[PDB]
Amino acid sequence: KNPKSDKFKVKRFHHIEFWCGDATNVARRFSWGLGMRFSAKSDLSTGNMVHASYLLTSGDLRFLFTAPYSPSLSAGEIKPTTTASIPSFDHGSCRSFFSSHGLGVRAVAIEVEDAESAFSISVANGAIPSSPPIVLNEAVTIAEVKLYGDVVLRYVSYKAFLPGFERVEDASSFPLDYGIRRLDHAVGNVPELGPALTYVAGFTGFHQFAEFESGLNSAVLASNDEMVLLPINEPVHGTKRKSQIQTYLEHNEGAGLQHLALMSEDIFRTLREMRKRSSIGGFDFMPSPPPTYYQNLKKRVGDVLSDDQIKECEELGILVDRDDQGTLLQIFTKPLGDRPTIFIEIIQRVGCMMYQSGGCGGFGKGNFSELFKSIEEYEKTLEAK
Amino acid sequence: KNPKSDKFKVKRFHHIEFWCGDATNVARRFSWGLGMRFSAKSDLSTGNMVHASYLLTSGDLRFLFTAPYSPSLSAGEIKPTTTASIPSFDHGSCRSFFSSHGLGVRAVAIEVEDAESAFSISVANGAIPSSPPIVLNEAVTIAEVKLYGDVVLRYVSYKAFLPGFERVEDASSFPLDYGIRRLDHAVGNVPELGPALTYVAGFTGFHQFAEFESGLNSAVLASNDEMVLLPINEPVHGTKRKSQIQTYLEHNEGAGLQHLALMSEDIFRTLREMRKRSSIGGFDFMPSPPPTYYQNLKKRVGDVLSDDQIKECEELGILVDRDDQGTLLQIFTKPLGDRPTIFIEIIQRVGCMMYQSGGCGGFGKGNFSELFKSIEEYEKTLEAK
Ligand SMILES: Cc1c(C(=O)c2c[nH]n(C)c2=O)ccc2nnn(C(C)C)c(=O)c12
Ligand SMILES: Cc1c(C(=O)c2c[nH]n(C)c2=O)ccc2nnn(C(C)C)c(=O)c12
Ligand SMILES: [Co+2]
Ligand SMILES: [Co+2]
Numbered sequence: 001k002n003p004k005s006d007k008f009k010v011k012r013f014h015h016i017e018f019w020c021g022d023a024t025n026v027a028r029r030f031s032w033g034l035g036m037r038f039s040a041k042s043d044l045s046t047g048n049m050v051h052a053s054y055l056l057t058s059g060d061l062r063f064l065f066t067a068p069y070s071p072s073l074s075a076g077e078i079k080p081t082t083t084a085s086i087p088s089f090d091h092g093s094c095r096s097f098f099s100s101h102g103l104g105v106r107a108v109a110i111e112v113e114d115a116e117s118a119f120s121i122s123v124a125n126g127a128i129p130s131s132p133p134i135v136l137n138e139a140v141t142i143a144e145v146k147l148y149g150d151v152v153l154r155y156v157s158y159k160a161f162l163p164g165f166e167r168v169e170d171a172s173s174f175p176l177d178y179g180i181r182r183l184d185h186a187v188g189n190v191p192e193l194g195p196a197l198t199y200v201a202g203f204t205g206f207h208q209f210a211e212f213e214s215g216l217n218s219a220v221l222a223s224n225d226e227m228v229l230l231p232i233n234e235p236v237h238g239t240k241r242k243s244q245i246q247t248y249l250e251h252n253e254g255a256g257l258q259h260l261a262l263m264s265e266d267i268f269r270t271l272r273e274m275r276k277r278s279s280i281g282g283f284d285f286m287p288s289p290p291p292t293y294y295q296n297l298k299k300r301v302g303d304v305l306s307d308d309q310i311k312e313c314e315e316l317g318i319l320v321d322r323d324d325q326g327t328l329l330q331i332f333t334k335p336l337g338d339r340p341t342i343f344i345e346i347i348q349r350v351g352c353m354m355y356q357s358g359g360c361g362g363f364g365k366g367n368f369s370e371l372f373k374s375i376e377e378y379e380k381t382l383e384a385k
Numbered sequence: 386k387n388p389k390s391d392k393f394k395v396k397r398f399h400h401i402e403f404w405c406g407d408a409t410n411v412a413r414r415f416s417w418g419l420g421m422r423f424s425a426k427s428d429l430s431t432g433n434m435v436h437a438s439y440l441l442t443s444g445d446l447r448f449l450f451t452a453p454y455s456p457s458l459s460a461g462e463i464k465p466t467t468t469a470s471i472p473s474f475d476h477g478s479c480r481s482f483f484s485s486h487g488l489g490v491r492a493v494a495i496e497v498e499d500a501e502s503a504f505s506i507s508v509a510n511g512a513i514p515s516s517p518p519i520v521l522n523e524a525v526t527i528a529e530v531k532l533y534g535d536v537v538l539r540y541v542s543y544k545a546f547l548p549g550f551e552r553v554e555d556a557s558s559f560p561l562d563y564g565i566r567r568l569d570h571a572v573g574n575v576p577e578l579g580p581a582l583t584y585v586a587g588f589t590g591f592h593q594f595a596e597f598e599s600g601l602n603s604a605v606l607a608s609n610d611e612m613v614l615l616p617i618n619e620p621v622h623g624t625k626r627k628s629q630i631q632t633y634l635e636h637n638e639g640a641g642l643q644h645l646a647l648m649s650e651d652i653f654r655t656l657r658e659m660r661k662r663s664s665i666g667g668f669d670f671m672p673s674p675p676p677t678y679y680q681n682l683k684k685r686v687g688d689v690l691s692d693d694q695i696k697e698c699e700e701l702g703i704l705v706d707r708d709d710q711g712t713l714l715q716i717f718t719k720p721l722g723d724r725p726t727i728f729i730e731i732i733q734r735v736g737c738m739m740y741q742s743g744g745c746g747g748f749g750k751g752n753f754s755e756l757f758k759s760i761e762e763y764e765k766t767l768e769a770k
Contacts, residue, residue, distance in 0.1 A: 021488070022405070022406060024721075029410045033413075070636060070638050073636070103406070103407040173664070176665065250457070251455060338407050338428070339455075340429070
């Protein structure tokens with residue numbers, strides 16, 4: 001049941017902004033590791049004396065990497081005379097964010113029909129303001145409200161990347177592509193799920209998205225057409241193995257974005273490409289499930305995936321779960337940086353054709369149980385041996 | 386003339402430590418871009434609750450990348466009970482360094498016979514102390530004194546990487562190698578050369594190394610066998626084109642390390658490998674000199690390099706200079722990070738065989754003149770056209 005109760009018109013995920021210490025090195029590492037091309041920049045070479053911002057793209061996926069210059073470079077400036085291309089940026093906030101959380105997501109940006117109205121309605125409905133609506137070059141409006149922790153939800157709307165950004169010279173823009181195409185969902189970790197859900201659903205009108213002992217409780221908020229999907233987790237205390245949600249909050253110094261799920265148009269090719277680069281500057285993946293997990297795949301997805309595709313899932317370490325409507329293939333990277341906080345999910349969904357409906361196949365909640373049972377069977381198999 | 390006046394026994398460059406915001410992403414980028422393998426780590430997985438440190442190696446070259454965790458993780462600790470593997474590390478200092486300078490070199494480390502005596506003698510001779518001698522696991526002694534700006538000169542001595550570091554698992558250690566073999570020299574930029582030279586030569590006993598209108602004055606300090614080479618630059622003001630040394634001081638917020646020169650055993654192969662990766666996560670190089678520069682190469686190094694090697698220098702953008710004792714091949718990267726501050730030089734020296742004597746061929750000072758004349762001739766050639 002989707003009551004379609006959005007309080008403003010939301011279109012789709014627009015971009016994700018990382019706040020970095022050095023945006024150059026993070027962006028180059030992500031570009032090689034994820035197969036995203038350098039598409040736009042705003043830095044000293046474009047007249048920005050305030051921050052360095054580099055944009056990577058793959059299909060519709062946009063990752064923005066931003067870091068501050070020395071404040072001394074823009075000492076003469078005031079907000080009305082700023083050279084920053086993102087006027088919500090603030091040296092002090094950026095340094096405090098990164099000092100407090102390390103590398104991670106500052107902004108989850110969604111495209112809306114009218115960012116000014118989205119901001120007004122949001123705050124009228126309980127959102128905590130972060131940056132007021134600002135119109136850039138009479139062409140794009142940006143506004144920001146607090147989402148959770150130090151993460152903001154950013155509204156962007158276009159009259160017809162951003163003004164002040166320059167498209168990147170083809171020589172520096174190598175056309176990497178490993179198959180990633182868009183942001184599927186963006187997941188937050190919070191100390192208390194209930195108040196976080198009430199707050200965000202409160203000011204967006206986003207509804208609970210229906211789903212279907214291991215560290216978390218979660219719920220998913222969704223836009224009208226369910227193409228903007230915002231899951232939120234809380235830890236469950238008093239277990240035997242410590243909650244990874246609690247571990248996150250400790251190392252992140254509080255709530256923040258936990259993982260970004262990136263849709264691939266061919267998850268086999270994405271994972272082959274990413275795995276070739278894991279030890280030469282790219283991203284590492286979580287340890288693969290045991291062969292028992294994959295033997296168990298025939299009995300639950302044998303009608304969707306052939307035996308060859310199931311064994312290709314096994315070679316690549318890919319997980320599979322299924323809804324009543326569709327099938328999901330997924331895998332998780334190790335943490336993106338020094339701290340055991342943010343990671344990335346690669347995902348591809350099968351089914352729910354009408355275009356594919358958002359969230360088709362769920363989010364893989366069933367894989368917590370299947371991973372447990374598969375690890376237990378595998379140990380018993382070898383113990384027997 | 387080398388008066389061999391070192392005040393303690395200095396062996397060779399040991400390592401260079403970068404202070405980072407996220408050590409994971411900088412280290413992976415450098416590894417791919419320079420062809421250095423992951424060799425050792427000290428982080429949460431080794432019991433270090435204070436900092437993440439990752440060591441890359443190529444031949445004898447050691448790059449250490451370090452970033453702080455949340456101070457909350459080590460709140461219970463005191464220096465006598467620390468889990469840090471580098472006891473001079475300090476959260477506040479590291480955050481201030483990076484906030485002030487961005488990505489750059491915190492420590493130039495040299496191996497000495499006795500780090501405690503090197504520290505005592507240094508301070509007795511004017512060095513400003515930074516971290517007192519500390520003996521690690523009864524096996525290695527580390528001490529630090531101020532060099533210039535927020536850069537320290539670090540002494541390391543071994544009884545027989547560092548205690549508390551673990552060697553890295555072969556799977557995560559891909560044996561990259563593009564030919565780089567050791568640190569040749571490490572160059573500082575300061576506002577006033579005279580007092581910097583007096584200070585450092587004062588407490589080391591290092592002597593001036595003999596050399597042979599464009600932005601700088603420089604001088605080179607050297608150890609007894611001239612294998613530790615520490616050039617220092619100051620800007621020259623009142624020129625037409627602004628001094629790149631002054632630009633550095635402005636964007637770096639004061640003095641600091643300007644470039645690291647990395648010796649290659651085959652600079653042609655290094656530059657081919659590095660240039661293939663420039664647009665896929667590696668390092669970019671300065672714009673190549675015009676063809677006139679390379680036509681002029683025959684008249685000054687035609688006796689050292691064949692016409693094929695000279696045209697291979699041209700394909701790769703390599704510079705050539707020569708002393709009265711040896712020949713030098715060199716090239717410069719664009720800045721390593723967001724700010725126009727630190728960069729890297731790749732170098733290979735021809736001559737002075739006895740082993741090769743340090744500094745053989747100089748540092749390429751003659752290339753400032755040759756680059757000017759070559760750019761002038763090339764423009765006149767095309768202007769004529
Ligand atoms: C992150 C994750 C998801 C996931 O992505 C979501 C779960 N709920 N929602 C809304 C989601 O987006 C699904 C199954 C998983 N199974 N095992 N693991 C281990 C490596 C610890 C997971 O991390 C894991
Ligand atoms: C850095 C550099 C050196 C160098 O490495 C040293 C010069 N003196 N000492 C002690 C050194 O180590 C030599 C010649 C150069 N010619 N042109 N350029 C332009 C790209 C701006 C240089 O940057 C350049
Ligand atoms: Co997910
Ligand atoms: Co040099």
